């Protein structure tokens, strides 16, 4: 139990993360196919001493969409919390920013949301 | 003093709004040039009985980017507050959503911010 592990969204995109004892998140985020071209570095932070009162654990991380194969000239951050229990979950909202010209900066940043569990969608029921 | 009036962002885009006694915002939003093709209906709501402790007045409005001249298939909402006084201001964050296919819905909504005053730039 905890943040460290392998997490999936509903489309099977997969992040493999290690939560260090003093707050680091490190790992990789890849597609459901999981080939090298699909894999990107992830880094972030989390609250390593959450409140003892039923609250979740605050966290965030970033992926820049460049690897050795391709480069989208964009980066996403996810902000959310880890929630333990019968099926642990990370609930997030995200911001995806593209590198743009100054004239197009007003339309640089998309907002959205996603949720992750430790259950692979092919095994989900 | 009040929300009713003519407001400008730093680029001179201009909204003309009436704040009704029971919370309606109604008006138009147009470009700095102010040609007919540039003008759209603006509709929203505001707190008609705000706190009396120095807090701003919560509000929001929507513009759908269709008029009788053109249609961008998108709509923006602004969420923010009106701050009164000598230099009245409306500070906002906005969401701009495009009509998209289901496949593209993940990239349907942009976020941003803007501020408005009654002083024409």
């Amino acid at each position: 139990a905890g943040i460290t592990g392998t997490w999936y969204n509903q489309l099977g995109s997969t992040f493999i993360v290690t939560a260090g004892a003093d707050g680091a998140l490190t790992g990789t985020y890849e597609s459901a196919v999981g080939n090298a071209e699909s894999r990107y570095v992830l880094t972030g932070r989390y609250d390593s001493a959450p409140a003892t009162d039923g609250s979740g654990t605050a966290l965030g991380w970033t992926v820049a969409w460049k690897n050795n194969y391709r480069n989208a000239h964009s980066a996403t951050t996810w902000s959310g919390q880890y929630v333990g229990g019968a099926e642990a979950r990370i609930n997030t909202q995200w911001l995806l920013t593209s590198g743009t010209t100054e004239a197009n900066a007003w339309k640089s940043t998309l907002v959205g949301h996603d949720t992750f569990t430790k259950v692979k969608p092919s095994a989900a029921s | 003093a009040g929300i009713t009036g003519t407001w400008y962002n730093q680029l001179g885009s201009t909204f003309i709004v009436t704040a009704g006694a029971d919370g309606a915002l109604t008006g138009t939003y147009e470009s700095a040039v102010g040609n007919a093709e540039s003008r759209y209906v603006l509709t929203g709501r505001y707190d008609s009985a705000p706190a009396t402790d120095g807090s701003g007045t919560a509000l929001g409005w929507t513009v759908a980017w269709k008029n009788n001249y053109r249609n961008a298939h998108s709509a923006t909402t602004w969420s923010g507050q009106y701050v009164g006084g000598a230099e009245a201001r409306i500070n906002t964050q906005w969401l701009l959503t495009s009509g998209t296919t289901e496949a593209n819905a993940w990239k349907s909504t942009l976020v941003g911010h803007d501020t408005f005053t009654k002083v024409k730039p």
Binding site: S74 | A103, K107
Partner: peptide, 12 residues
């Protein structure tokens, strides 16, 4: 850019 191959990573 926001290329289509990024969709799944964003839940869409």
């Amino acid at each position: 850019a926001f290329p289509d191959y990024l969709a799944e990573y964003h839940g869409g």
